[PDB]
Amino acid sequence: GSSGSSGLKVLTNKASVMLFMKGNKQEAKCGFSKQILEILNSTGVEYETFDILEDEEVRQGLKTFSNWPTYPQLYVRGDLVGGLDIVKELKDNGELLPILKGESGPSSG
CATH architecture of structural domain 7-103 = 3-Layer(aba) Sandwich (3.40)
Strands 80-82 and 73-75: antiparallel
Measured distance CA(43)–CA(62) in Å, rounded: 24
Task: Say if residues 7 and 63 touch (Cβ distance below 8 Å).
Answer: no
Cα–Cα nearest to 74, from 60, 89, 84: 84
In sequence order, what DSSP letters do the residues of 45-61 get, joined into one string?
Answer: S-EEEEESSS-HHHHHH
Task: Say if residues 51 and 24 touch (Cβ distance below 8 Å).
Answer: yes
Q: Is 30 annotated as a binding residue?
A: yes
Helix axes 84-93, 33-42, angle to 10 degrees: 30
Method of structure determination: NMR
Residue type, 107: S
Output the CA torsion 96→75→24→1 (10° steps). -160
Cα–Cα nearest to 2, from 68, 53, 57: 57
